[model samples]
Target chain A: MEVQLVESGGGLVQAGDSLRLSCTASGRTFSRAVMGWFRQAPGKEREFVAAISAAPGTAYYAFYADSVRGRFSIAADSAKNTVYLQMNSLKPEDTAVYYCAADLKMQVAAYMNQRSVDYWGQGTQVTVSS
Target chain B: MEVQLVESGGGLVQAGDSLRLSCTASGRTFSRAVMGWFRQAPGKEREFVAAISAAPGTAYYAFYADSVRGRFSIAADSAKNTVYLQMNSLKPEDTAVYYCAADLKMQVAAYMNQRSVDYWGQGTQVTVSS
Candidate 1:
């Protein structure tokens, strides 16, 4: 599949303000693919922030990974063809490259759940400045 | 906390063969971090293939993300202080940059569970050429 993911409409934001970003995917449907958004601070490795399920539901649920769950949130709209990552009370430490990533396939392997990210957005640079 | 991830000993392999890689972390303990591995083909976006919990137990589990959990397996040894990515029946398409990633802090923000990848290995370039 010729998959493509792109994120745009973002810029510097003052620290302590709420933060929101966008991502759009082409060449596939997100109605049922596991999706995860990630971040990479300048000079830091990529980090997982949150995820939105591809599986359609009453407002497909969003979940934060273990460490960053409470502080970060993700809102995804498959039908709208968009996914958004939102954070409350952003800080300078939150500055990084935020990415919209999707899985090409959604198969269940291990025991309960989980998987890897395949498709990705160019990633918008979010600067939580003073 | 000055964390580091490293991948050692990787190289070319014939098509239809198996592949294995190793990653070690320093400065902290893997005893409690959400870990995931990513693969990026030449000029392709990073793709998530699997993940492991930082918690200890009888045979800590490894789970594949959707399309790849079948042919791929992740063995994380907290005692050995290393994580391994294993693949069978490799193909030219399987060639790419494999990264060992870790989530430094474990928190919960969403409904069920999930999050981002923080620290990463230098990434081993695997070439499956016949």
Candidate 2:
């Protein structure tokens, strides 16, 4: 079966508005994989924003990069096989491409190393403007 | 030691031109790490372009993504602690942010996953236009 990751809910967004991007996974057991979010601003380094474990019947634990710890959050609905990244009070600096990655390994969280993210959503660009 | 990565050689390029982006690494043994390049076109998925093994006394093998197999190449200079991505016959579609990641593992090769890319250059944007 071909693994497919489709992302939506990204487009032009005004500054100070709340934004949500969704990633729907198919062809794999979504509940058994590690899903993560990444951001890359124009002419900037790509940052690992946050990640969530999707194992069923377990307390969901999320990890975030220090710079975005309080600025971003992740919510997952395993039943729908989807994950969402929510951001509030978005600013112009918040503009970037948000990507959803499947099967990313995050055993050692500090440095943010992924064993390999084989499946990725095409990424949704969030343009924040006044 | 502070691991620093600096990128250069990116900017506006007319279509059908040649482009070269460079990444210089410091605070680590250059020849002992794996270096890789990534591309993120505007409003699109981030693609792992290619990678090279910087291990000394080795054959110096490079791995490439299927799409960019014949479109790009990488060159490394351990003495300068730098790696470069060179592209020829650039097109408008080639416009994107070229990022240099240090210590990206390529054991599996396909699907493109990094054990952890702790050190990354700020990225250089290449704008290809008529």
In terms of DockQ, the best-performing candidate is 2
Residue by residue across A23-66, what tens digits does model 2's lDDT show? 88873536546788877786654567888874437467788887
- Candidate 2: tens digits of C-alpha lDDT, residues B22-130: 8887635365567788877766645778887754233577779877777788877767778889888888988987777766343322333433554556657899997
Docking class of 1: incorrect
lDDT, candidate 1, residue A76?
71
Write down the DockQ of candidate 2.
Answer: 0.11
What residue runs in model 1 are displaced by over 4 Å at the alpha carbon?
A1-130, B27-29, B105-115
Report the TM-score of the second chain of model 2 against its true counterpart. Answer: 0.83
Against the true structure, candidate 1 has what lDDT? 0.66
